[PDB]
Amino acid sequence: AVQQNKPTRSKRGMRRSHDALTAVTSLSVDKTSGEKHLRHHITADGYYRGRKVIAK
Amino acid sequence: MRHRKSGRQLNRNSSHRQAMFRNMAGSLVRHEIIKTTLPKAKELRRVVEPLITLAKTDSVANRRLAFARTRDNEIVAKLFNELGPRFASRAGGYTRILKCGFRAGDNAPMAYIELVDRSE
Amino acid sequence: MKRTFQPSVLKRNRSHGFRARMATKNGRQVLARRRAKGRARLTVSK
Amino acid sequence: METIAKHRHARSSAQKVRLVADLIRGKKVSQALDILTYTNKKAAVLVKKVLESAIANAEHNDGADIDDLKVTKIFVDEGPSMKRIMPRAKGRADRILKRTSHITVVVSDR
RNA sequence: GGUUAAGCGACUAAGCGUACACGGUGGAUGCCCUGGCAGUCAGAGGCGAUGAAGGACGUGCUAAUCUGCGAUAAGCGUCGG
RNA sequence: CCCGGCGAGGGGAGUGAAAAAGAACCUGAAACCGUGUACGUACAAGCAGUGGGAGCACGCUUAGGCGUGUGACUGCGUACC
RNA sequence: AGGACCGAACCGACUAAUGUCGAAAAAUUAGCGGAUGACUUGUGGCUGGGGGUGAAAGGCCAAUCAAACCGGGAGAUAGCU
RNA sequence: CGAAGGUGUGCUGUGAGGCAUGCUGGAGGUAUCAGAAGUGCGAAUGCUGACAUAAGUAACGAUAAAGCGGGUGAAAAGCCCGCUCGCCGGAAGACCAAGGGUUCCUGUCCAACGUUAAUCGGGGCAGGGUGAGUCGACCCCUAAGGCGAGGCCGAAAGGCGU
RNA sequence: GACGACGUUGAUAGGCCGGGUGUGUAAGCGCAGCGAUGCGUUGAGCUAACCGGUACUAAUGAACCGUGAGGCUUAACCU
């Protein structure tokens, strides 16, 4: 539970070698509305494969 | 170790779990759409689809059966009285899940459950 | 737990009050040191 | 022509804003707005509210061009601390310091 | 010029190291004074029941606190500058 | 004036000798923290330096080669009080 | 009638758990001993450091007690780090 | 037409150091030779201020419990309403004394505080509200008990007491 | 985190019809009983994850990283 001899800022870096946020670059474009949602999701205006699905 | 089990626990005791899925399914058919998280959406489906299955073949005894599982006759009033000819032909599924997005409250995978036949 | 300061103003007044501490000569020196050490609140006042 | 926007004293920590403002290093703006509109975090609330304020400083003060407009440098650097006192058990305290951070967004056409 | 094999063989760098350029936090150094200590020189060497030292509560154009003052309350009269 | 939540914060403009003097305000070191460029680095172990040293990268002279950065690999080497 | 029985309140702390950088500088869940007495609680007083008080443990005297705490002797003294 | 200080740089001395200079800096510095000391820091589990590390780990404070729709709004698991669900009920209900002293309420705001966000709050800004011949005290009467005119007693204070 | 099965050229999941399984004579009517209840309907009814099928819903066109015949020298075979 304790540290006896403080690790350098070197090894503090290499522990942070894998924290990097996964990119969500894979956007989609609508079939018959042309707008952009996230893939397998709905827009801000209720479109999903060219349908007013939620009408909100 | 879950190997070939089912019915996710959703981090509540069984007594709490069953009593929520009542009052979401009561809430589901009254407003016809709900926003929930993804698993509750994914597992309200496995609970509600018995109801409109056991309400096409209308009987006297099945009224209490959807009252023993519901204890809400106003929801039972919408069943059997509109839902009958609404679902004669759908041999099977009645929910088109929609993956909406992300809860700005606490980063949940939000979603949308509906009955299929929508015109309002 | 029953913590030590279970307060009052009736215990407080007749112990650490003005006329209590400015009764005797041994009390009076405290009132004549809190003066000279320049404290605002002399002993206890409401 | 070059322009810079800064949000000073953003109420978080340096590694919390370093992680999403690592992806938008060396990007164009419209792919950066689209990688920050759908990153589910709090720093993506922070700097995407400021990265759009940087392109405002182009279309208004510097180069109105936004289509082919790059982001050159972006580096979140530390700020002060709100040293409150946290109570730990058995009578002893704990000097918490609520962290605070500064972010620059630098926008130009290299 | 092509072909099989044999030997040898960089640029890759998730991060990390070092030097420079860049700030980031930080508030040390130099500089500054109506702050304070030690004394020289005279003067005083007391205030107090024709109500003290130290305080409370009020007073202005005012919300507050400091200074001053006290139902005549940031001030009255009086003789001067 | 633009952007923002008619927030915070910030970029221009105007004052000003200067806003890398802006109310957290003269000067602003070090620890610590990042940005960029250059080099080394994923078969090598060990007080992390020193002696030697290829290549690469640069300021240059004067084109013969020094200066600075890094430093593969190698010889020794078990911190201070 | 009972310093009588059973058992809540109230009280006390027996056993185990948990906790023991605690939710707490002595607790929480499961039980346990009593519960019209030599009991329990509230409020207002009295006693005082070689002194109080004690169904006596050197227990208690503001989480500290084989002599409390603050200031003053006093910058004690230290053949000792 | 740039003092000290800071920050690099080329030179220089056997070392402690010195001298010239680029940038930053914006008003003070001090030769030569001598005089006096709060005169040179790595340690003392030294003091003080600041910043690392463990670590983005642990934990979020009782294992009474949520779920949905609408609205306000820039953004809503937590705020306001409605609809059910679940928990306390010799209490986790409602009044009072103690003790706290605006903590109650409307408008408004989210920097900070609330172990999170927050339009909400016992938070900040502003205003408002507490109305008694009978309620409690003050007031008339004593207990335990404290002072204590004369007095007794004691180096002095002061102790006991009518 | 990996490995595996599918993504409308679909049985990968949920639903659904049936079967299987488990519990036992559902409810509601009528009869017998003043009544509790017993009988008939009725080995009915209800049935988590099990097995066999059915696309009813959910598993989209893309977008994306990954490229553009692969260095030096010698030998042995192509001519």
Swiss-Prot record, chain A:
GO cellular component, one term: cytosol
Coiled coil: none
Superkingdom of the source species: Bacteria
Subunit structure: Part of the 50S ribosomal subunit. Contacts L17.
One Pfam entry name: Ribosomal_L32p
Region (Disordered): 1-37
Family affiliation: Belongs to the bacterial ribosomal protein bL32 family.
Keywords of the record: Ribonucleoprotein, Ribosomal protein
GO biological process: cytoplasmic translation; response to radiation; response to reactive oxygen species; ribosomal large subunit assembly
Name of this protein: Large ribosomal subunit protein bL32
GO MF, one example: structural constituent of ribosome
UniProtKB/Swiss-Prot annotation, chain B:
Molecular function via GO: structural constituent of ribosome
Biological role: Requires L15 for assembly into the 50S subunit.
UniProt key word Isomerase: no
A cellular component term, taken from the record's GO annotations: cytosolic large ribosomal subunit
GO process annotations (BP): cytoplasmic translation; ribosomal large subunit assembly
Short name of one Pfam family: Ribosomal_L17
Taxonomic lineage of the native organism: Bacteria, Pseudomonadati, Pseudomonadota, Gammaproteobacteria, Enterobacterales
Keyword Nuclease: no
Protein's recorded name: Large ribosomal subunit protein bL17
Keywords: Ribonucleoprotein, Ribosomal protein
Superkingdom of source: Bacteria
Family: Belongs to the bacterial ribosomal protein bL17 family.
NCBIfam families registered for this protein in UniProt: L17
HAMAP family assigned to the protein according to its UniProt record, in alphabetical order: Ribosomal_bL17 (MF_01368)
Subunit structure: Part of the 50S ribosomal subunit. Contacts protein L32.
From Swiss-Prot, chain C:
Biological processes per GO annotation: cytoplasmic translation
Gene3D superfamilies (UniProt xref): 1.10.287.3980
GO molecular function: structural constituent of ribosome
GO CC field: cytoplasm; cytosolic large ribosomal subunit
InterPro entries from the UniProt entry: Ribosomal_bL34 (IPR000271), Ribosomal_bL34_CS (IPR020939)
Keywords: Ribonucleoprotein, Ribosomal protein
Pfam families: Ribosomal_L34
Subunit description: Part of the 50S ribosomal subunit.
Family of this protein: Belongs to the bacterial ribosomal protein bL34 family.
Protein name: Large ribosomal subunit protein bL34
Gene: rpmH
From Swiss-Prot, chain D:
Biological-process GO terms, alphabetical: assembly of large subunit precursor of preribosome; cytoplasmic translation; cytosolic ribosome assembly; response to antibiotic; ribosome assembly; translation
CDD domains, per the entry: Ribosomal_L22 (cd00336)
PROSITE patterns per record: RIBOSOMAL_L22
Gene Ontology molecular function: any one: structural constituent of ribosome
Binding locations of L-tryptophan: 90
Description of how the protein assembles with itself and partners: Part of the 50S ribosomal subunit. In TnaC-stalled ribosomes forms part of the binding pocket for L-Trp with the leader peptide and uL4.
More info: The wild-type allele (erythromycin sensitive) is dominant over the resistant allele, and is also dominant over the temperature-sensitive allele at both low and high temperatures.
Record-stated family: Belongs to the universal ribosomal protein uL22 family.
NCBIfam families according to UniProt: rplV_bact (TIGR01044)
Protein name according to UniProt: Large ribosomal subunit protein uL22
